[PDB]
Structure formats: C-alpha cells, structure tokens
Write an enzyme that holds these catalytic residues in place. Sequence first.
Site, PDB file in Angstrom:
ATOM      1  CB  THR A 156      -0.996  -0.052   1.272  1.00 16.44           C
ATOM      2  OG1 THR A 156       0.244   0.592   2.319  1.00 16.44           O
ATOM      3  CG2 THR A 156      -1.766  -0.832   1.015  1.00 16.44           C
ATOM      4  N   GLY A 192       0.267 -10.733  -7.012  1.00 14.67           N
ATOM      5  CA  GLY A 192       1.218 -11.913  -5.709  1.00 14.67           C
ATOM      6  C   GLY A 192       1.049 -11.843  -4.654  1.00 14.67           C
ATOM      7  CE1 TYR A 196      -5.910  10.733   8.207  1.00 16.46           C
ATOM      8  CE2 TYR A 196      -6.679  11.466  10.347  1.00 16.46           C
ATOM      9  CZ  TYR A 196      -6.010  10.315   9.243  1.00 16.46           C
ATOM     10  OH  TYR A 196      -6.882   9.234  10.360  1.00 16.46           O
TER      11      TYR A 196
HETATM   12  C1  LIG Z   1      -7.038   2.777  12.213  1.00 20.86           C
HETATM   13  C2  LIG Z   1      -5.573   3.323  11.406  1.00 20.86           C
HETATM   14  C3  LIG Z   1      -4.784   3.570  10.800  1.00 20.86           C
HETATM   15  C4  LIG Z   1      -4.268   3.938  10.593  1.00 20.86           C
HETATM   16  N1  LIG Z   1      -2.584   4.698   9.548  1.00 20.86           N
HETATM   17  C5  LIG Z   1      -2.033   4.206   8.567  1.00 20.86           C
HETATM   18  C6  LIG Z   1      -0.497   5.341   8.847  1.00 20.86           C
HETATM   19  O1  LIG Z   1      -0.104   6.201   9.996  1.00 20.86           O
HETATM   20  N2  LIG Z   1      -0.116   5.100   7.322  1.00 20.86           N
HETATM   21  C7  LIG Z   1      -0.802   5.081   6.596  1.00 20.86           C
HETATM   22  O2  LIG Z   1       0.035   4.146   5.432  1.00 20.86           O
HETATM   23  N3  LIG Z   1      -1.692   4.085   6.498  1.00 20.86           N
HETATM   24  C8  LIG Z   1      -2.600   3.183   7.305  1.00 20.86           C
HETATM   25  N4  LIG Z   1      -3.989   2.783   7.221  1.00 20.86           N
HETATM   26  C9  LIG Z   1      -4.111   1.421   6.911  1.00 20.86           C
HETATM   27  C10 LIG Z   1      -3.575   0.897   6.849  1.00 20.86           C
HETATM   28  O3  LIG Z   1      -3.344   0.643   7.521  1.00 20.86           O
HETATM   29  C11 LIG Z   1      -2.217   0.337   5.523  1.00 20.86           C
HETATM   30  O4  LIG Z   1      -2.636   0.911   4.345  1.00 20.86           O
HETATM   31  C12 LIG Z   1      -0.823  -1.042   5.586  1.00 20.86           C
HETATM   32  O5  LIG Z   1      -0.128  -0.433   5.397  1.00 20.86           O
HETATM   33  C13 LIG Z   1      -1.832  -2.104   5.311  1.00 20.86           C
HETATM   34  O6  LIG Z   1      -1.059  -3.046   6.403  1.00 20.86           O
HETATM   35  P1  LIG Z   1      -1.796  -4.790   6.710  1.00 20.86           P
HETATM   36  O7  LIG Z   1      -1.047  -5.794   6.897  1.00 20.86           O
HETATM   37  O8  LIG Z   1      -3.123  -4.352   7.382  1.00 20.86           O
HETATM   38  O9  LIG Z   1      -2.625  -4.758   5.059  1.00 20.86           O
HETATM   39  P2  LIG Z   1      -3.823  -5.141   4.976  1.00 20.86           P
HETATM   40  O10 LIG Z   1      -5.315  -3.932   5.247  1.00 20.86           O
HETATM   41  O11 LIG Z   1      -3.925  -6.989   5.645  1.00 20.86           O
HETATM   42  O12 LIG Z   1      -3.554  -5.444   3.301  1.00 20.86           O
HETATM   43  C14 LIG Z   1      -3.235  -4.029   2.308  1.00 20.86           C
HETATM   44  C15 LIG Z   1      -3.506  -4.593   1.181  1.00 20.86           C
HETATM   45  O13 LIG Z   1      -2.104  -5.754   0.709  1.00 20.86           O
HETATM   46  C16 LIG Z   1      -2.653  -6.761   0.403  1.00 20.86           C
HETATM   47  N5  LIG Z   1      -1.186  -7.109   1.112  1.00 20.86           N
HETATM   48  C17 LIG Z   1      -1.260  -7.315   2.385  1.00 20.86           C
HETATM   49  N6  LIG Z   1      -0.463  -8.335   2.900  1.00 20.86           N
HETATM   50  C18 LIG Z   1       0.074  -8.574   1.361  1.00 20.86           C
HETATM   51  C19 LIG Z   1       1.348  -8.910   0.801  1.00 20.86           C
HETATM   52  N7  LIG Z   1       2.196  -9.947   2.102  1.00 20.86           N
HETATM   53  N8  LIG Z   1       1.753  -9.627  -0.017  1.00 20.86           N
HETATM   54  C20 LIG Z   1       1.300  -9.196  -1.058  1.00 20.86           C
HETATM   55  N9  LIG Z   1      -0.363  -8.439  -0.813  1.00 20.86           N
HETATM   56  C21 LIG Z   1      -0.624  -8.149   0.732  1.00 20.86           C
HETATM   57  C22 LIG Z   1      -3.797  -7.171   0.478  1.00 20.86           C
HETATM   58  O14 LIG Z   1      -4.423  -7.904  -0.291  1.00 20.86           O
HETATM   59  C23 LIG Z   1      -4.633  -5.175   0.672  1.00 20.86           C
HETATM   60  O15 LIG Z   1      -5.065  -5.612  -0.380  1.00 20.86           O
HETATM   61  C24 LIG Z   1      -4.362   3.185   9.058  1.00 20.86           C
HETATM   62  C25 LIG Z   1      -5.663   2.347   9.055  1.00 20.86           C
HETATM   63  C26 LIG Z   1      -6.378   2.274  10.429  1.00 20.86           C
HETATM   64  C27 LIG Z   1      -6.862   1.254   9.622  1.00 20.86           C
HETATM   65  C1  LIG Z   2     -11.125   8.287  13.510  1.00 14.68           C
HETATM   66  C2  LIG Z   2     -12.774   8.389  12.164  1.00 14.68           C
HETATM   67  C3  LIG Z   2     -12.658   6.954  11.847  1.00 14.68           C
HETATM   68  C4  LIG Z   2     -11.392   6.671  11.233  1.00 14.68           C
HETATM   69  O1  LIG Z   2     -11.357   7.401   9.734  1.00 14.68           O
HETATM   70  N1  LIG Z   2     -11.196   5.763  11.103  1.00 14.68           N
HETATM   71  C5  LIG Z   2      -9.912   5.246  10.407  1.00 14.68           C
HETATM   72  C6  LIG Z   2      -9.792   3.542   9.982  1.00 14.68           C
HETATM   73  C7  LIG Z   2      -8.628   5.740  10.177  1.00 14.68           C
HETATM   74  C8  LIG Z   2      -8.213   5.938  11.976  1.00 14.68           C
HETATM   75  C9  LIG Z   2      -6.743   6.795  11.633  1.00 14.68           C
HETATM   76  C10 LIG Z   2      -5.954   6.488  10.852  1.00 14.68           C
HETATM   77  N2  LIG Z   2      -4.860   7.632  10.978  1.00 14.68           N
HETATM   78  C11 LIG Z   2      -4.467   7.185   9.273  1.00 14.68           C
HETATM   79  O2  LIG Z   2      -3.281   7.530   8.201  1.00 14.68           O
HETATM   80  N3  LIG Z   2      -5.907   5.963   8.609  1.00 14.68           N
HETATM   81  C12 LIG Z   2      -6.849   6.479   9.590  1.00 14.68           C
HETATM   82  C13 LIG Z   2      -7.428   5.643   8.877  1.00 14.68           C
HETATM   83  C14 LIG Z   2     -13.629   9.529  13.275  1.00 14.68           C
HETATM   84  C15 LIG Z   2     -13.984   8.496  13.879  1.00 14.68           C
HETATM   85  C16 LIG Z   2     -15.249   8.762  15.236  1.00 14.68           C
HETATM   86  C17 LIG Z   2     -15.978   9.938  14.018  1.00 14.68           C
HETATM   87  C18 LIG Z   2     -16.030  10.374  12.764  1.00 14.68           C
HETATM   88  C19 LIG Z   2     -14.428   9.869  12.204  1.00 14.68           C
HETATM   89  F1  LIG Z   2     -14.027  10.690  11.298  1.00 14.68           F
END
Ligand SMILES: Cc1cc2nc3c(=O)[nH]c(=O)nc-3n(C[C@H](O)[C@H](O)[C@H](O)COP(=O)(O)OP(=O)(O)OC[C@H]3O[C@@H](n4cnc5c(N)ncnc54)[C@H](O)[C@@H]3O)c2cc1C
Ligand SMILES: C[C@@H](CC(=O)N[C@H](C)c1ccc2[nH]c(=O)[nH]c2c1)c1ccccc1F
Lengths: 560, 539
Positions: free
Chosen positions: A221, A277, A480
């Site tokens: 990602t 992959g 953001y």
């Molecule tokens: C609360 C919250 C906070 C977040 N904060 C950030 C942040 O600060 N920065 C950020 O960049 N993103 C953030 N994200 C988004 C997310 O965590 C990232 O995009 C992260 O890189 C996904 O990792 P994962 O292991 O959860 O992948 P998944 O969500 O399990 O999968 C991601 C994608 O990659 C594929 N995939 C996963 N593992 C592999 C592998 N080994 N080989 C090939 N394909 C694979 C899956 O098929 C899917 O298409 C956040 C999300 C949430 C919910």
């Molecule tokens: C915090 C947010 C919900 C949300 O966006 N959650 C996702 C999973 C999330 C939360 C934190 C993140 N940091 C980042 O880089 N990507 C992120 C994505 C939220 C909570 C409650 C009400 C409104 C709202 F936007």
Amino acid sequence: GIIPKKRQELMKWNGWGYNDSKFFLNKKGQLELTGKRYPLSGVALPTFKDWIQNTFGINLPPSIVNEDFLHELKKTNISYSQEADDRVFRAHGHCLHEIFLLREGMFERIPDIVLWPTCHDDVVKIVNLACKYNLCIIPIGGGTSVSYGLMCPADETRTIISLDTSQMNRILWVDENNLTAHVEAGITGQELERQLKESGYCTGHEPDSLEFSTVGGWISTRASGMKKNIYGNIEDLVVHMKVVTPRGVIEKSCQGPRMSTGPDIHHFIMGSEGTLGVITEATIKIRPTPEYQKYGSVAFPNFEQGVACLREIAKQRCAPASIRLMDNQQFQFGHALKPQVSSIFTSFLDGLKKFYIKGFDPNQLSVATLLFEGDREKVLQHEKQVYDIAAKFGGLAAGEDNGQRGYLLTYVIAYMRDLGLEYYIIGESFETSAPWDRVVDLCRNVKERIRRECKEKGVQFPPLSTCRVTQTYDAGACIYFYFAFNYRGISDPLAVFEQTEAAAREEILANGGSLSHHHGVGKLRKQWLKESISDVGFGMLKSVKDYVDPTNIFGNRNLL
Amino acid sequence: GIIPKKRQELMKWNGWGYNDSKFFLNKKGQLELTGKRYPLSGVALPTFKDWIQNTFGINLTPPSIVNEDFLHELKKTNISYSQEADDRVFRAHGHCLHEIFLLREGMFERIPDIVLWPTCHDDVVKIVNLACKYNLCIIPIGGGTSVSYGLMCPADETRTIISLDTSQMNRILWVDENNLTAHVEAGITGQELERQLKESGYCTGHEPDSLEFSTVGGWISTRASGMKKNIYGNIEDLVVHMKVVTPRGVIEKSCQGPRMSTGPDIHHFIMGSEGTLGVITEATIKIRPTPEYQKYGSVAFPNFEQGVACLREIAKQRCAPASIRLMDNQQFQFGHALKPPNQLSVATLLFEGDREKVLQHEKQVYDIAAKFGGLAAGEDNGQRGYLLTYVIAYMRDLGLEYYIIGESFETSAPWDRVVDLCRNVKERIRRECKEKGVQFPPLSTCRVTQTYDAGACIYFYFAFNYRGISDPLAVFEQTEAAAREEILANGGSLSHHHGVGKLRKQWLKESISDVGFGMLKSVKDYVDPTNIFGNRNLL
Ligand SMILES: Cc1cc2nc3c(=O)[nH]c(=O)nc-3n(C[C@H](O)[C@H](O)[C@H](O)COP(=O)(O)OP(=O)(O)OC[C@H]3O[C@@H](n4cnc5c(N)ncnc54)[C@H](O)[C@@H]3O)c2cc1C
Ligand SMILES: C[C@@H](CC(=O)N[C@H](C)c1ccc2[nH]c(=O)[nH]c2c1)c1ccccc1F
Ligand SMILES: Cc1cc2nc3c(=O)[nH]c(=O)nc-3n(C[C@H](O)[C@H](O)[C@H](O)COP(=O)(O)OP(=O)(O)OC[C@H]3O[C@@H](n4cnc5c(N)ncnc54)[C@H](O)[C@@H]3O)c2cc1C
Ligand SMILES: C[C@@H](CC(=O)N[C@H](C)c1ccc2[nH]c(=O)[nH]c2c1)c1ccccc1F
C-alpha cells in the site's frame, strides 16, 4: 504482538482494535476507555461528552471448495479454516461502509477458505495449487485497509482463498554491519519494533495502524509513518524483497544499497495492493534505538501562519521526527480531552478563552505538535532551532504536555468510531498530498465543499470538517481531514456519506491535491486512477499485471 | 552551455570534451591542460610526467538510406535535420574505450541514418508519429556521455535509424519558488541548468562528473548519481514529475503532490529505461537555495581498512558531508603527483551549507576520524582532489597517445563486503593481465565515492601499457568482464550508476530474476510493440 489465528479472541469482530478497549461512561457519567492497554486507558475525560454534544447535537453463505484441492491441501500441513467467523473477519478492512455491513448486515462475498502459511515455501505451494485448481487469492495481513483493498468482488465465482500472513512473522536475520533486518512479511509493526529493540535497534516506521499492520501490507500500500522525516517512508526503508507470483518468484540477486540496473522492479511491487502476488520476505533498514525523545508544541495566531512556518521548516530542511499542525477545531478537541472538571455554568468557548488568557484569538489559533528523537545533545539543539523558526511566525511555546498528549491520542482516535456509531455519529478520515502553494486554499475549499454538500443532502447540522498537516516534504505536504456528522433522519446515511466523501475527493483534485498520499486506491479510488497516472501509465500497470498474473489469481480487483 | 547542432565545432570529434582542452607538454616539459575552461587549465603539473613514467613505464561511411515520403513530411515540420556523415558519426557512440577506438582508427558497423533536432515536446510527438508511420527506429541522445554502449546502433538494424538529439530542447520552462521545483526541457545540460538557476539564487546540486554535457533526460534514463547526493539526493530523489513520449502516447501524472500512494510508481518504469521506451521531454526537479559556503578537507589513515571503517561510522551517525571519498594508496600517490606508508589511505571531504554549520560539522567529522587513526591532511588536498574531478576524463586521450589504455568501472556493495571486494577485484585484474601477456603490472586502484546506510559505491580504475600485445582491446574487454565477474562473486552489484546499456546485458536477468526481466519486457512490448525505440539496451 503476534496476531492469533482466531482473531476475534483478541480483536473486535465488528470494529477497530482490541476487545478490551472501548469508550464507556464511567460511574460519574464521564467518557473513559476500558482496559489498561494505552496510557489514556482508564483515564476519565470529563469534558469529552460536552464537546461531543456541542459538536454533533446529540445527548449521550456456504463454503464452496474443491475436494481434490482440499485433499492436496491436507498433505502440506498448512493450517486452514472454512469457518464463517474466520472468513468474515477477513472479508473487510476499516472503511465505514464495511463496518456497517459487519454491524447491521452481511457482505455480498466473503472468502471461501482461510489459509495460514508459516513461510515462503508454504506460499509457493499455495500459489501452485491456485494455478492448478483455478482459485482466486486475496492476501491479508493486518486487515487495516482503508481503500476496499480486501473486499471480495461480488461476482467472483471462483473459490477465494484468504491468504493470511499473520503466522509468517519471524525476523530472519539482523545485519548489524549493514544496518538491515530481513523479515517475513506477516510481522506487525509493534512486534517488529519490540523484537528489534531487544537488540538495541528499531525501524522507526510507525503508521498509526502499527499494532496490526504488517511489513507486507506496508509495501503493498506504500505506507507512510509518523517519523518518516528521520527514517523514511516504506519506499526509502525497503532494500530487498521476495515475491511469489503465478509466473514465479521475484527477487534481486544482491543487496547493494543503490543500483542502476534498469527500471527498479521493487517499485513495480510497491503499491501493487495484492494484485500481483504475495510479498513473503523483505529487508528493511534499521537504526540504533534513539537515546532520547522530546515532545513539544507551538501555538500560532492562525492556521495560515502555522502552514507558513511548516513550509519554512521544510525549506531549512530541519523538520523534527514528527511535526503536525492542527486547525482550530482540533486544537479545541484536544482541549476537551484534558482531566480538569469545568463548572457546568461556564460555556465550552468561555472556558477555553479564560484558560488561555497568549494574546491570540481562541477561535482562530492553531497548534503544532512536535516530536524529536535521537541523541539527547542533538535533539535538544534541534528543538531550539525549530522553536526559533516558529517564533518568527508568531509562534509561542505551548508545552511538552500537549505534544505528549497529541502523540498518545493517535492510537486512541480509531476507537472513537465505534463510540460515534453507538450515538448516530458517522465519519471517516481521508487524506491527500499537495504542493506547498495549494495547501491553505485546498483545506478551506474542501471543508467548504463538505458543508455545502451535507446541507444540500438534508444533513440537519453542519458536519465536523477539520484538518491537520501531518507530513512535510520539500515540495509540499500531507493533509489529513476528518469528516463526521449526525445522520438524524437521513433515509440513506451511507449513500449521503459515500457521496459526500466522493465530492470532497473531486474538490481535492480540483485544488491540486493528489488522489492519495498513503491510504492508496484499492477499490475505493479506482475511477480516478487513469486520470491521475495517464492512460499509457494505466496500460503499463495493466501489462505488468497481465504478465505476472495472466489468469488473475490475485483477483481482489484493486487499482485497475 | 547550449551544445551546438554541429558538435564538432566545439567538442572533440574523437574523444572527450571541448576542443580547447587537451593535455600537452608545456615549455618547461611539464604536463598541462590547454585553454582557460577549468580551474586547472594553464596550471603546470610538475610531477605528473614522472608519475606516469613510473606507473606505466613509458617515456614521452555508409550512405544515408531515407524514404523520400518521410523526408517530404519531415521538411514540412520545419524540424532541423542532417544526413551528414560527421553529424551521424558524432552521435553513434558514447565513451567506452572500444568505441573511442572505432572512432579514432576504424569505423562503426552502424551509425544513425539521420539526425533530428526537436526543440520541444510537440516536435518530439511529431517525430515519434512519423517513426510509427514509416517504420523508423529512434535512438535518443543527449550529451552522448553513455559508458554502457547505450547509444551504439545495433549492427543488424535494417530500418532507418533516427538519432533524436535533445540538445536544442534545453530551456527552463518555470521556476516555482513557492514549492522549490524547476520544470525544464530534458535536453538541458547540467552546467547550463546550474548556471541559469544560480542567477535566481538556486541550484539542483546534482553534479555528475559529466555535467558539462550530460542532460536531465539522460540522468533519468540512466539513473544518474551525483557527487553531492548526500545533500541533494540522486536523480530518483530529485525528480518530482516527468513527461514521456512513447509510441503508445504520452505518459504524465496529473498532479505534482510531493508523495503519493497511487499504485506502482510509474516514474520508476521510466527511470533507468535507457532510451528503450520513449523520449523524456520535460521534467520537474527539486531545487535548493545556493549554499552560502564551501569548505574542503582531507584525512590521512594508516591504511584503507581503517578509512573504510571510518566512512562506515560516518554513515552510521548519518553525518556525511556533501561529498566524502576515500582513496587507496595508489590514488593518494597519484593525487600527490598532481600538485602545482605504501598502505596509507586518504579521504577527501567537501562540506557545503551555512558557514557556522559547516565549521561545526567539520569538527564532528575530524573527531570521528581520529578514532580510526585519521589525521587531518589539509584543505588544499581536498580542494585539489575535487578540482581534478572534471579533468580526469581528458587523461584518456593523453594515454592513448602513449600506448596506455584503461577505463573506470563501478559497483555498489554492502558495507561488510567492501574491503574484500576491493582487494579481490584488484588482484583479479593483476592475475588476468599477467595471463594475457601484459608486460607490466597494470594500474588497478579504487576509491569509495559514495556512502549509504546499507553500503558504498566503489569506483575502480584499470589501465595498462599495451606494448607488445597483438589484440590489446580484446585483452582489455576480457579483463574488464573478468573484473565484473569478480565484483558479482564478492557481493557487488552489476552497476551503481553507469547502467547496463548493451555492455552488461548478459548479467541483467540474474540480477533482477527471470520474472523481473519479464516484467520489463511486458512494459516495453506494451508501450513500444514495434520496437521503434530500438537501441536494444537492457533487454
Ligand atoms: C486506524 C488506522 C490507522 C492507520 N494509519 C495509517 C498510517 O499512519 N499510514 C498508512 O500508510 N496507512 C495507515 N492505515 C492504512 C493501513 O494500515 C495501511 O495501508 C497498511 O499498509 C495496511 O497493512 P495491513 O498489513 O493491514 O494490510 P491489509 O489491510 O491486510 O491488506 C492491504 C492490501 O495489501 C494486500 N496485502 C497485504 N499483505 C500482503 C502481502 N504480504 N503480499 C501482497 N499483498 C498483500 C491486501 O490484499 C490488500 O490489498 C491505517 C488504517 C487504520 C485502520
Ligand atoms: C477516526 C475517524 C474514523 C477513521 O477514519 N478511522 C480510520 C480507520 C483511520 C483512523 C486513523 C488513521 N490514520 C491514518 O493514517 N489513517 C487512518 C484511518 C472517525 C471516528 C469517529 C467519527 C468520525 C471519524 F472520522
Ligand atoms: C567523464 C564522464 C563522467 C561521468 N560521470 C558520471 C557520474 O558522476 N554519474 C553518473 O551517474 N554517470 C556518469 N557518467 C555516465 C553518463 O554521463 C550518465 O549516464 C548520464 O546520465 C548520461 O547522460 P547523457 O545526457 O550524456 O545521455 P546519453 O549518453 O546521450 O544517453 C544515455 C542513454 O539515455 C538515452 N536518452 C538520452 N536522452 C534521453 C531522453 N531525453 N529520453 C529518453 N532516453 C534518452 C540514450 O538513448 C541512451 O540509451 C559519466 C560519463 C563520463 C563519460
Ligand atoms: C579516466 C579513465 C577513463 C575513463 O574511464 N573515462 C570514463 C569516460 C569516465 C570518466 C569519469 C567518470 N566518472 C564516473 O562516474 N564515470 C566515469 C567514466 C582513464 C583514463 C586514462 C587511462 C585509464 C583510465 F581508466
């Protein structure tokens, strides 16, 4: 730190995070987080309810699988499940629509079977079986996707394997001479840092999802972390990788730090979002664990002055490990999370004004939070440099306690969705990157497009629409946004949400912002991709996918 | 700073650089560079002759085949062109040793049939369209400084070959002082780019040794690296945006966001593509305020290993100056011989930035260096080392007049392989030369030119007196191939910066894996199904 196979034992089946961690009203009617997992866990937030009230106006499917494949699968000793709870847990990430279908509905399509490979060779076996039996594979690591990257296409008729990487989680070697660590792709960020720290090292890659997100996920990602100013984003950190594709294994033959050997194929995989992959192993740069960390914060007269200051800091190339500039609503929100009990006969706003009696307007003021890390001597000199720069833009030191608080808040904010959902409040965060000269206008117009679009869609109250600048680069910034509203009397709240989120994205692109800084495209932003990267660029992506994955085994349908 | 269309007006038709710049023996019998163009130009080098004698024991055209409907349409575009032999020959090669021989005392199997000089993106689009329509082959050329056979026309290419020369597409389009980025046409040379930006108070800081002639387009095509990458980055860190004309159409991202997650980064499909996919016509590059102050330095170490260890520590503390280069004993003697104990090594330093930070930094580096037995050896050494940078290429033409041949070559390697790789490669060159009848032990020397978190760039020079060999080019070719095999066997890469071109094609598939190679091929076959971009580099 290892994700267990039956995830719901530890993690919530219907929302973000750990089962032991949720917001509840305590015996004094104050919001508080259960459990003891985070430093804010078990701490009353006496003003939080009020800020919620003031802000939102509320009162507080069978397993279809080939028996021959089954039989062959058993010989491998690769662990698997056709249980509904295992399949459902892996059918989604953390987009708002997904969380609703978990709560009050069901998914159109979920994986038919979940496999847990424990090593590179297991993955090769699985991919070979998928070629033989015409199976579709969707990889999953942490399940933290926010782009519909894990959603199973509704009309995919083949058997879908959820290829869960969580049990491939070893650090294979730490090379202290070259400062690199070679690791299996299923290791989570928290487990990775925890184990490296025992040897005196870290990666410093700290996405907000690090508790669950994996090395393979990050690569897939193009993940970005809080402290990228020091350690780099995922593309700067990864030195080597190994990828199992239907065509065979991709891997470079050496670990030279920088090459000129044609187009860099690492970048064909980075950002591929599970369409080509499985990334099984990677080598990632490590650093000695920092001696010393220092938090900090700075108030500016307004957001614009704060943005100008961030720009100058970027221009002098002296950005700390982390710097974030929050708008006045987020400044307020953070105020609302401190522990001192207000009198009920003094307002929220009049409570803020007397508290900060700065010669600043408390409805305009913005705050930057700061984190410095490294050798204590260096950190402290560097902190003084930034604060001197900030002084020139009207900046006033606002204390380490806000910085420290802001930095803790980041791992807690995701737990606020589910709280919101208990009380008719929905929303989501979204992001962009933009040139320095578009940032102010972009933030203003996007927040405004969201107000006009909510009002026109019958949203009763003006939505929360708020922003911060989370990263600085030479050529611009990551912005953001959070968008939230009370869906009181809307016929189709999701539609309204979905449509407003698309309109914000249209506004973003029209103001010079990118399609994504870090969340990616998945299935959520597919319709803009071709325009973002050009037709020929899109066809180049397609040509790599048709070569490496000609039968579309990796059938999540992201990107293209 | 503009390269003229008739390059031979200013540049040596048979070698490197400007016509006004050659080594000669002055009126005191000392070596000296003619002209006024470099800070060393017209400066006597009293002991360089002596060093050379000690070291090497010496004393001191086919017609243009062109479709007339094509030429007829070409005339209507008003795009300047030539079928003259001297124009075509000038653009039929780069700066590998074997090519400089076919240029001097032989002739090339194949040279471009026609030279076109587009002045803008739209010209380039017209040209590529005409190539589709008339089945022509296009080989792009900027500075002509390739050291990988990247410009060589394949001998059996039967189509008409266009040399698409980018030197007249050389303007700065805009300088965005808010975002610190400059949008430029791809044919601008490094010196002209820095000169123009410096009038506005800016620079890119990208300084490859070939900057006088190498171009933005070239740098992106070959993944060029510059002397001060520690501060400014390599080309992949500098380029924010680009526009590319392929037979399939124009590649260009829709925005200039500093960092994206929008799938695989397609900039990286073009960077390193070495003229095989299309023409890079425009690029946006990061700029910086010109540094306030420069300071040179040098440090002596008791031996090479100690120097290497110190470089590693410097990289580990992430406090590298703008440039830090460590040379082995032989290069230290060389350098000593070019002013106006057999294992002792020397690092040259260049710091740049604000004066007070520089002075602070310099102390910090000397401090680190003292821990590995490093002793300060003066600013003048460092200065001299860096001023030699732009004149070493002129020494080839010197050597060829006196039966001395050689080439530089490079690799990148993990920190823990550097010392063994240096020692083993240098010994393999000795071994190979003796076995092929080279009378005197070759010069075989190295320096570390760049440091990174995970390793270093190592830069070798190999040279010998070919007195009494019957096929001296074949001895050279085989010895250089052997050195490359030794590098790969000791953990070094196929190339740090020179690229692959046609010279290192045979190793590519092993370096990037079969499926990797297959990924590159599928992109080429999509973007360019009829191989209009047919220099045959990489694949
Ligand atoms: C609360 C919250 C906070 C977040 N904060 C950030 C942040 O600060 N920065 C950020 O960049 N993103 C953030 N994200 C988004 C997310 O965590 C990232 O995009 C992260 O890189 C996904 O990792 P994962 O292991 O959860 O992948 P998944 O969500 O399990 O999968 C991601 C994608 O990659 C594929 N995939 C996963 N593992 C592999 C592998 N080994 N080989 C090939 N394909 C694979 C899956 O098929 C899917 O298409 C956040 C999300 C949430 C919910
Ligand atoms: C915090 C947010 C919900 C949300 O966006 N959650 C996702 C999973 C999330 C939360 C934190 C993140 N940091 C980042 O880089 N990507 C992120 C994505 C939220 C909570 C409650 C009400 C409104 C709202 F936007
Ligand atoms: C004395 C000397 C010093 C050198 N020092 C360095 C150094 O410090 N660092 C370094 O990295 N390299 C160096 N090189 C190698 C060379 O200068 C670089 O590879 C440089 O990037 C090539 O640029 P150019 O414009 O000269 O391209 P050329 O040599 O003209 O072309 C190189 C390749 O790119 C293609 N090409 C050129 N322009 C375009 C375009 N606009 N679009 C598409 N394809 C194009 C050509 O077909 C060819 O395949 C040096 C070479 C010499 C001779
Ligand atoms: C200087 C060298 C010839 C040489 O290799 N010149 C090429 C064109 C060159 C010159 C300088 C370079 N810097 C760099 O990164 N790559 C470079 C390649 C040389 C000259 C005379 C005798 C032997 C010899 F190796």
